[PDB]
Design a protein around this ligand. Structure first.
Ligand SMILES: C[S@@+](CC[C@H](N)C(=O)[O-])C[C@H]1O[C@@H](n2cnc3c(N)ncnc32)[C@H](O)[C@@H]1O
Ligand SMILES: [Zn+2]
Ligand SMILES: [Zn+2]
Ligand SMILES: [Zn+2]
Lengths: 247, 159
């Protein structure tokens, strides 16, 4: 054999078949889009690895104390799985108090255990989107939503003064008065699109005394799947039976 | 078999289509940076598993040398191709053509890979090496893919 052998039987015939080259439409659509509107610029923003507090600090008031989680003797399996009491009150364990030590898997946000297989791509009528290059399983922690933590007063000021020339909109509600604004600063999570039938969801966790938002998989996804969540006036192009029509 | 074209390289495929199909331009032949040079550069980038990389390079060369004149040309490019064959016979296509057409190769090779006499593990290994080479192309996209390698076809060419 070989590592890269030639095709046999009908593969030889197809390989030697004369066919005028055609660019596939899942690439060529970009050209018509670039003629109707402009070729999209590289989306620029300040990449940060942790939230930036502007005029508020999203304290949760909760000190994560120890659970009754059992430390597995086999160092192969992780410690704080689905029945962790801290995990059940949506608090990540503290490293100083967790009985599972460095085997605890209830420290995913604070250990920045982001999924490393995400890729920004161009979606036909939705602009920039995020897809996963590998499969994901339900409940998997994917990424943290990062940005500037501002008050609703600060966010309204920003919208009045500099977000008037903007056709998108980059913010999560961390609170009824606090917002994570990723217009200027954030991470790749700012490119994740809305869906009326999402495969991911945002969860608010208390991580060592502060609130942090993480994107977790709602269901299993194969490779090449675009990440979506429910944003909770734009026409919605999510393409799903029983679509709400508007984001 | 799905070969994944790097997302960064798709706008270049659009540009290539625009240059050849709309603007009636032609890639400079013989290529100043031919497919053989690019494969040699990738093989050296890997050795900086050697028999494996060389097998991938040889296979890409063989597939390209069969597929360039059959499936990798826009219709507007057919005369030039004929010209090349007349001007430099017995020169393989991997020595005459360059980066845009080698990239075009991966748009169509996946259909052929479904008929290779390999099992699942070896086919996965081959796809691994192919995607590795494709992301190598994506890394060096600034030097490899450029409209400056294209020129307006003379009025003689249009007949
Ligand atoms: C947080 S941004 C997401 C990234 C955006 N696609 C981009 O190009 O930067 C949200 C914006 O994307 C667009 N968008 C997100 N989901 C959409 C959807 N399901 N249908 C149509 N547009 C959507 C809307 O214009 C919205 O203002
Ligand atoms: Zn626990
Ligand atoms: Zn724990
Ligand atoms: Zn929808």
């Amino acid at each position: 054999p070989g590592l890269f052998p030639a095709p046999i039987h009908v593969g030889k015939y197809l390989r030697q078949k004369r066919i005028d080259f055609q660019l596939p439409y899942d690439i060529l659509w970009q050209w018509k889009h670039n003629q109707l509107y402009k070729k999209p610029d590289v989306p620029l923003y300040k990449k940060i690895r942790s939230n930036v507090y502007v005029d508020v600090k999203p304290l949760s008031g909760y000190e994560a104390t120890t659970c009754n989680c059992k430390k597995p003797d086999d160092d192969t399996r992780k410690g704080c799985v689905d029945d962790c009491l801290n995990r059940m009150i949506f608090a990540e364990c503290s490293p100083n108090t967790c009985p599972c030590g460095e085997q605890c898997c209830n420290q995913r946000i604070q250990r920045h255990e982001w999924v490393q297989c995400l890729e920004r791509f161009r979606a036909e009528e939705k602009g920039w989107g995020i897809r996963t290059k590998e499969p994901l399983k339900a409940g998997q922690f994917i990424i943290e939503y990062l940005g500037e933590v501002v008050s609703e007063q600060e966010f309204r000021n920003r919208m009045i003064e500099q977000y008037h020339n903007h056709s998108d909109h980059y913010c999560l509600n961390l609170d009824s008065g606090m917002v994570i604004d990723s217009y200027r600063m954030g991470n790749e999570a700012r490119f994740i699109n809305h869906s009326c039938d999402p495969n991911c969801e945002m969860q608010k966790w208390s991580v060592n005394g502060v609130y942090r938002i993480g994107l977790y998989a709602l269901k299993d996804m194969p490779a090449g799947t675009e990440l979506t969540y429910d944003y909770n006036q734009q026409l919605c192009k999510c393409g799903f039976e029983k679509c709400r029509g508007i984001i | 078999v799905k070969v994944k074209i790097p997302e960064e390289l798709k706008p270049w495929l659009v540009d290539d289509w625009d240059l050849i199909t709309r603007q009636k331009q032609l890639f400079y032949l013989p290529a100043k940076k031919n497919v053989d040079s690019i494969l040699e550069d990738y093989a050296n980038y890997k050795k900086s598993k050697e028999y494996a990389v060389n097998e991938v390079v040889a296979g890409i060369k063989e597939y390209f040398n069969v597929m360039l004149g059959t499936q990798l040309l826009y219709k507007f490019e057919r005369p030039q191709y004929a010209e090349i064959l007349a001007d430099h016979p017995d020169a393989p296509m991997s020595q005459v053509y360059g980066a845009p057409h080698l990239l075009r190769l991966f748009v169509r090779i996946g259909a052929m890979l479904a008929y290779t006499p390999l099992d699942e593990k070896s086919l996965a290994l081959l796809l691994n090496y192919l995607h590795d080479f494709l992301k190598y192309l994506a890394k060096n996209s600034a030097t490899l893919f450029s409209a400056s390698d294209y020129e307006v076809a003379p009025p003689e060419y249009h007949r």
